[PDB]
Amino acid sequence: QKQQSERLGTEAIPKLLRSLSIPAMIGMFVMALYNVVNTIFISYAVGIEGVAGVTIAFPIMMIMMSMAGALGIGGASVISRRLGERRGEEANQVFGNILTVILVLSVIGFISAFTLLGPALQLFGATSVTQGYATDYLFPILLGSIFFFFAFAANNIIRSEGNATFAMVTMIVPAVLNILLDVLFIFGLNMGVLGASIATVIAQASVTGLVLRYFLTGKSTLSLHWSDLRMKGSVIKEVCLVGLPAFVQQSSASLMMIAINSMLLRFGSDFYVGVFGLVQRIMMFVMMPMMGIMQAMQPIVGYNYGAKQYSRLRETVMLGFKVATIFSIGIFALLMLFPEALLRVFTADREVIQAGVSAMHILFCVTFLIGAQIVAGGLYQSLGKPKQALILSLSRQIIFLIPLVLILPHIFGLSGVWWAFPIADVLSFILTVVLLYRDRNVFFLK
């Protein structure tokens, strides 16, 4: 019991999602812009060498980010599950008693920066060139760790409450900055990776300075305390609880895409790593459309569970679903009528727009089904019972994906790329379907 500051708690619930989604739909899309408009520089004051440096260094970023993402997520499904179920002050506690574990790692990172940086880095396809870059990239980042962590937790929990809007602005803003911040060093100076890396710390600092405001200054949305608010609850236990499947999802994908970057450093030293980098943020970029919808419900389907209008949250979940789908099929179509013009950035041989696009062809006759497949995941999450969600990811990401590449690559070919995805994913979808007639309670409406 505290004071539920504006945002909502309202039951104006379709425009809830509507004007809870779009802020992700924007922020994300723009940080997706930054990603873009940043890298391309590093194809300039440096060529493609460091562009790999990054692409290898990359996963090691996500290593922490998964860790603070679990952290960030817990928060979001706790704090909403406790703002319908209105233990208002518990939230206050949580918030801070997370900031603990963060500041724990915001140090461990600092530590390993000075420690495990190289040790780990060198450990795979260490092209004497791209090596230094990744270091010169990674060294800053870890220093460095602190702002980074915070800002994602924060920009996650503020969704967990209601502020996808100021989220917008925890977002839009590093972006715009970073752009002009990089330009600054990378090009205008010549602090290449070396300093587009410090450009993006000065980014994640400058937000944090701001996030303190929207958490101290006119302590917006909610229960937000600062002196001894936190300590180290036995609540800690309770977010690692929510988060376990959260940091799995990444440390499933992340821990597997270091591999496919470095097994491809044994074949294509740098030519083929920059194009990994490339294929991602078109998955990711035109993931967003989905991704964003989910974070709407994240807290919506959060304080609605929380002993409130069970009635109207299914409304969320059916709608939730209902939308997604139309983007599932939307992307999917657009992802297989324009696999041509998107391989018109990949312009090379007339064989490149062949088995290059053959994978991209029916590799993704799956897409339209992916909608649910992921909606489901925030709705075992917006409702702290990720034990089934725990269950879930391990299918999609590992215990069905890997045990499919492997069973085509024993020997089945560049067919072992293709069938391995299309189909692994659909066993994952079929599976999910059953976890909801397992639980005729989320969607206890149709």
Numbering used by the authors: 3 to 448
Quote from the publication.
Integral membrane proteins belonging to the multidrug and toxic compound extrusion (MATE) family contribute to multidrug resistance by using either the Na+ or H+ electrochemical gradient to extrude drugs across cell membranes. MATE proteins identified thus far can be separated into the NorM, DinF and eukaryotic subfamilies based on amino-acid sequence similarity. Those crystal structures revealed a similar protein fold comprising 12 membrane-spanning segments (TM1-TM12), they nevertheless suggested different arrangement of cation- and substrate-binding sites between the NorM and DinF proteins, hinting at substantial mechanistic diversity among the MATE transporters.
We replaced DinF-BHD40 with asparagine, mimicking a constitutively protonated aspartate. This mutation abrogated the transport function, likely because the protein was trapped in a protonated state. We also soaked DinF-BHD40N crystals into low pH (∼4) solutions, and determined the structure to 3.0 Å resolution by combining molecular replacement and MIRAS phasing. The low pH-soaked structure of DinF-BHD40N is largely identical to the un-soaked one (root mean squared deviation (r.m.s.d.) <0.5 Å for 447 Cα positions), ascertaining that the protein was indeed locked into a protonated state. Tellingly, TM1 in DinF-BHD40N is no more bent than that of DinF-BH, suggesting the notion that TM1 is kinked in an extracellular-facing, protonated MATE transporter is not always applicable. The most functionally important difference involves the side chain of DinF-BHD40N, which participates in an H-bonding network also involving DinF-BHY36 (TM1), DinF-BHN180, DinF-BHD184 (TM5) and DinF-BHT202 (TM6). In this network, the side chain of DinF-BHD40N forms an H-bond with that of DinF-BHD184. By contrast, in the deprotonated DinF-BH9, no such interaction was observed between DinF-BHD40 and DinF-BHD184. Taken together, we suggest that H+ evokes substrate release by breaking the charge–charge interaction between the deprotonated DinF-BHD40 and the bound substrate, and by engaging the protonated DinF-BHD40 in an H-bonding interaction with DinF-BHD184. Our results suggested that the protonation of TM1 in DinF-BH induces the release of substrate without entailing significant structural changes in the extracellular-facing transporter, including the bending of TM1.
